[model samples]
Target: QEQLQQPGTELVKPGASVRLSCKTSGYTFASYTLHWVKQTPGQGLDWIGAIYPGNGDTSYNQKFKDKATLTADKSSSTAYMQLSNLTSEDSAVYYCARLDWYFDLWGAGTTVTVSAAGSDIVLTQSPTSLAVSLGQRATISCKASQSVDYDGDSYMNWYQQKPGQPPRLLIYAASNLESGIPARFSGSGSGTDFTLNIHPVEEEDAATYYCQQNNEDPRTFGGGTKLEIKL
Candidate 1:
């Protein structure tokens, strides 16, 4: 049973800071790197950066450098990310991503509501356990119950969201391309069964991610899936 467990809720005061932890099991922690993502209210997912517990090496999305910090302790086999300068705009769900060219596994997500006294938020998703063998092609779907309109096209889109950073576009228009993405990570299918495929899973490719469709109003995203290479 592979699993990524995240804190369900947290409260913080404005101007203060908070840290979230993600615990992983059923795999060797040293074999993979962890990433953090952020999803702001009424916005798409964003990638914060990644961390390697085996070496203590880290990388941050340029935009997230000032706001997000990534760290890990191999002794504990856990990854940690901290966000600073809390504000209402910072109120959103934060996720821990295990990657494989893209996210194949994800923590349930931790909701941080920045308020004077802080607040409680819940992380909810279905089908918690996922398994996939290396070199085997697979697909995961994310759908919104309703539709959202944006610039004449549905705002629905897929994102690789990490802590304290903006989400990176993976797929759009149910099958359209987003600039700068590699051909290997191709996306296909339509409606609610959208698929994101990686020809050959790479060690760095694993991460937690989601598929979103903005064709409808309010925009919607599928619960993120974390990618893991079978050992």
Candidate 2:
């Protein structure tokens, strides 16, 4: 019964501000700390800040210190984020996640458009949907608008999101598997192209996968690839 209900979209003017809400239920409202992540248009995910409803304690990414504010309403069992001085740069999707790590629960996300002013690398995923049989290999591809290779490594990451559940991190830095992720899941490729491979796909592997690039500012995620079991 745990759930996070977020509103759909928002359009605001430059210099103005907007407040996004994330309402929760089926859990103690003040016990867990809620964090915010921003995904600007065609950009990768960026950490914003977090709030502990219990004690009203808060923390913010230095970059977002002046742009975002976090708060909550314990009585309403909801979390809030207010973005100020809206600009084209602020136009993006914002997500609220439960906890600092493992972010096992997340809000569907709220899209915000900052009107006024105004990649400018969108990540594109291939095979929007795929049907793989048990024990078969599932390969999902993600191509960035441009090379995401920085220094000596690719900054791409992969995630798995199943129905009614938050996304789980599977691979990061292109091919490094996340801790606890099964070896069956691996990542490869660099520069503009990357792939997420799930070998011997299992029933539990049925889910949608997304790829993200963090090598540059305004990071972005691919459209997403859905995997279905072919029985």
TM-score of each: 0.54, 0.61
Model 2 root-mean-square deviation: 6.9
lDDT of 2 by residue, 68-169 (tens): 999999889999999998887898878887632334567888889887654316788888789999999999889888899988888788878776555767
RMSD to native, candidate 1: 13.1
Q: Report residue 151 deviation for candidate 2 (angstroms).
A: 26
Candidate 1 lDDT score relative to the true structure: 0.64
**Model 2 score (lDDT):** 0.81
Report the lDDT tens digits of candidate 1 across residue range 1-231.
Answer: 777778888988889989899888888776788877777544446667888888879888676788888888677778888889987888888888664323356787899988764211111223322456676655555544443444545444555543443345676655556677666677655433445666665554556666654353222355566666677
What's the true lDDT of residue 80 in model 1? 87
Which candidate should be chosen as best, given TM-score against the real structure?
A: 2
